[PDB]
Amino acid sequence: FEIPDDVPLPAGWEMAKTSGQRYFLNHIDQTTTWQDPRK
């Protein structure tokens, strides 16, 4: 299912890559998902 939780990619987001793990880049707020934006 990959990040299922009945919630797909967060709206108004833009994942990227730090300097693995990856994240949806929560620029809209002020942090970064390090495991799941909503699980």
Binding site: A16, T18, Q21, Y23, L25, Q30, T32
Partner: peptide
């Protein structure tokens, strides 16, 4: 180690 992503608190 595992550093966080860029764009931190202003």
């Amino acid at each position: 180690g595992t550093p966080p992503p860029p764009y931190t608190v202003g």
